[PDB]
Amino acid sequence: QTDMSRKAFVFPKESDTSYVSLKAPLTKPLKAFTVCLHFYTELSSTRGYSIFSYATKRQDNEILIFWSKDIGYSFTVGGSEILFEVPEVTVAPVHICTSWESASGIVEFWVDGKPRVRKSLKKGYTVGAEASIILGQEQDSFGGNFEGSQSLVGDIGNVNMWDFVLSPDEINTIYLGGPFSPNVLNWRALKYEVQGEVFTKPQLWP
Amino acid sequence: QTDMSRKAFVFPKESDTSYVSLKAPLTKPLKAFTVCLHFYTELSSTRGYSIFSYATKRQDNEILIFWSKDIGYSFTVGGSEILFEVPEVTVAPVHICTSWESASGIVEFWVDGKPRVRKSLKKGYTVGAEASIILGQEQDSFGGNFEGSQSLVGDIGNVNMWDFVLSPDEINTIYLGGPFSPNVLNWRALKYEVQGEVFTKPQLWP
Amino acid sequence: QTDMSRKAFVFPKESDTSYVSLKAPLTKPLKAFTVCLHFYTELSSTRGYSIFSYATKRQDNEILIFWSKDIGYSFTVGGSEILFEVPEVTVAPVHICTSWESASGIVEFWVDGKPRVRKSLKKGYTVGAEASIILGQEQDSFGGNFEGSQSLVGDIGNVNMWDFVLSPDEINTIYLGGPFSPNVLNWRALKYEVQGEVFTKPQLWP
Amino acid sequence: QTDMSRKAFVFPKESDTSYVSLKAPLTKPLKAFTVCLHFYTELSSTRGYSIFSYATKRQDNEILIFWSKDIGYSFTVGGSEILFEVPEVTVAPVHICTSWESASGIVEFWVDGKPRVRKSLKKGYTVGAEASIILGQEQDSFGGNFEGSQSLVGDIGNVNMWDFVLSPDEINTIYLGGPFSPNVLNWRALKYEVQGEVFTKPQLWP
Amino acid sequence: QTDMSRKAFVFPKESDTSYVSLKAPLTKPLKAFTVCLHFYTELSSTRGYSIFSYATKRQDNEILIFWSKDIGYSFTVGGSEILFEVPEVTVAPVHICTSWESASGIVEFWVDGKPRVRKSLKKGYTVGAEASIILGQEQDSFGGNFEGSQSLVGDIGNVNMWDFVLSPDEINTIYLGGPFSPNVLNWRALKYEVQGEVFTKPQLWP
Ligand SMILES: C[N+](C)(C)CCOP(=O)(O)O
Ligand SMILES: C[N+](C)(C)CCOP(=O)(O)O
Ligand SMILES: C[N+](C)(C)CCOP(=O)(O)O
Ligand SMILES: C[N+](C)(C)CCOP(=O)(O)O
Ligand SMILES: C[N+](C)(C)CCOP(=O)(O)O
Ligand SMILES: [Ca+2]
Ligand SMILES: [Ca+2]
Ligand SMILES: [Ca+2]
Ligand SMILES: [Ca+2]
Ligand SMILES: [Ca+2]
Ligand SMILES: [Ca+2]
């Protein structure tokens, strides 16, 4: 476990082999979650990349957040996809939170502490506990099958993940830097594994 | 009688069949009224939808508040329509208040705490007290016959009603979040009937 | 003697027959004056309309403040017209003051607290004392001959008149809602005559 | 002498014979200087005009500040011109300060308390002390030969002249209204001379 | 050994010949660096220019910071060029910090306090100690061969240079005007050498 407070991982050029592998302590399968993070890149109006990748040996897009060109954000759990379109694109660092709850199948998508309309996705699913979480590359198989054309080029940081659903208040206090307490993934106690060209440096966002 | 304070009704997907039914304790006909409510959708650029529908065995558009793409707001009482045009649309939650008075025929339309000019409509009409009030769908008959192309997808909440016309000071403190006593529909003691795929969640607006 | 404090005349529909008559305790002819007032409409982009008509049996446009579509404000005194151009038009309530002085011929025109350049007009003229002052229609004869295509739809209020010229400091306080004492027309002690479909409602502006 | 605080000269309409004449206590010839003033007109989109005209017997443009339509500010000392370009032109009051130095030829031009870049002009020159200074007309000879189409129509005031070069700090206060004492021209102690149709009224800017 | 505080070098016109030489107390070769500075010119929408030229005997563009019309900033070290596109251009003083690190190849580029994305450039390289550092002209040879069409017209100041990489806290303090202590070039103990029509005047930025 390592405190990465104030730091970030950076991926400086396109590649096929660079990535960070987060280890989570899961034992029970997920019936809801929240995930939040910060990232910064110029890719957005030239191609598309993977922002967060969650995979079991049985499904490779279990949960996955992804930017795709000329459309917008693309959230998917259990192989099924949903869209939040962005018309105007602009360059600056971005903070997102994203949550999903089985029973209702409602997903919320927060961009910079403002929320998008709610949507429905895979009501009643339960997400698998033995997983491969990966920054920088997109998985087409447990642990691997990366695609250079889906690479993150820039830095990414502040990834935290809870196994329940954050309320609008709590997402405001994470956004503003207030203390929270993750129970699946904690930036102040990370357990990760690096490979290829990725550096750890100070963060460009407040 | 339920206190819906700080909660809201969320319609996650398009339907023919999901809606909420508000039970209002009306005795006399209405000679004047004032209605207000919050609502958040991204439908506004693809099609129209009903925000508030109030129907009667003789008239299905007794009072109806409706967004119509590429023109703006439509407000109709007694099957008669009046139009507040809205040049530029943006996506964000909005609060509106609206009111009509038999004696003068004057309608006020308050968007986000700012007043539109006054317009005249249905002078001397009187609104029925035997009614069906529905959220989530437009009515074409007492109690149903829903249009999916008029479905509202998104959140709606804080609906309140008065048997008299509200004043500018009063609307302001509604907008600002001050206490009120509403006497026809009251969001802190609400008697409703819910049907379909609609859920109840904490509100995204402040 | 009526204290019209916090009220406005509302003309809710286009017509030929609704108006208000102001009674002015005139005795000496005018060699200089100042009038201010509030108003609010959506007509500005469709057609023009009259805001303040001052008629004497010898001249129907003795002092006439007019909005003409596609040009701006039109200020005429003594049948001579001077033009205050406005490029952008927006729907919101607007407050104006306007002055004239016989000795130098200089007119001022203030919109929402800011001044337009001074211009020359009717030096040496004297304005008549026995006259008809009408809100809502345009005059072509002492008290009569209305064209509907020049009528005003919307609200009008806080009209006040002095018989001298206000200083820039004075006009600022009238703007911020500070106190003054008019000496020709006084809104807090208004003597007037109503005729047609006009109502008297609380004012939309602060 | 005269204290002209809070007053201004106003030229109501275009003419061939109006202007005031400032009288200066010059003995030595100028090896530098700095001039500041306020003014307010709409002409700038129709034609150009003379803003401040300092002439000598040998040279009708010893120093001149001029607005040329479509191009921007024109500034000439000793017959030779330099430009500060201005693309967008909005009608409001404006404050200019501008200063020249012999030893380096450097000129600065401040508009509303903000500086344009530095340029070079008549390095080593020496301005003549027996000048004739005119507002509201352009000189083509000592105190004479006016062109009407170079006329200024509107308000000018607050003109002050030093015989050295003001620092950034000193322009700032004078812009902000603070006190700093001129030694060639002084608005609070003006010796002048009026001719034709010009008036003295309270100023429009703060 | 000079303190240049509150002052800037100023280049009033276009030339082949005017420039400033900065002398750096350099013995070991650079394996990393930061450099920061202020400038102000109206050139940016007519042509390009050089902001900071660093040249070695073997390599005339060892480190160089250049504005290219229609594109944005260009930054190159060791001959290799990298681009930070700037879409919209505005005339006003601007402040840039830039840095490079042999070990990882990461360059950073801060404009007016806000950071741009990290890129990669000449990993492993080391920069040379015996340099010619020049302001106002673009070196094509050790100490000369100036392009009149790559010349800076305007002011420039506050140039400082470290031999390590400044953290974001440090770069904000510099931007806000805080104190710092540079160790390769120092505006407050500057040892330099001038040539041509160039002057030293108080800075136009605060
Ligand atoms: C394009 N898409 C976002 C709809 C799905 C692509 O996912 P993938 O092939 O990398 O795993
Ligand atoms: C838009 N419109 C108001 C003119 C028609 C809507 O009618 P409806 O769907 O209640 O029948
Ligand atoms: C001055 N004007 C051209 C704008 C309008 C005059 O109208 P009218 O009062 O004669 O009817
Ligand atoms: C400003 N200008 C130098 C371009 C015009 C000068 O005209 P003039 O002084 O000879 O009358
Ligand atoms: C910025 N640039 C690469 C495009 C120009 C460099 O030009 P050069 O002057 O060293 O010959
Ligand atoms: Ca995949
Ligand atoms: Ca893939
Ligand atoms: Ca209907
Ligand atoms: Ca219908
Ligand atoms: Ca008339
Ligand atoms: Ca008429």
Ligand SMILES: [Ca+2]
């Ligand atoms: Ca001349």
Ligand SMILES: [Ca+2]
């Ligand atoms: Ca001339």
Ligand SMILES: [Ca+2]
């Ligand atoms: Ca070169």
Ligand SMILES: [Ca+2]
């Ligand atoms: Ca070159």
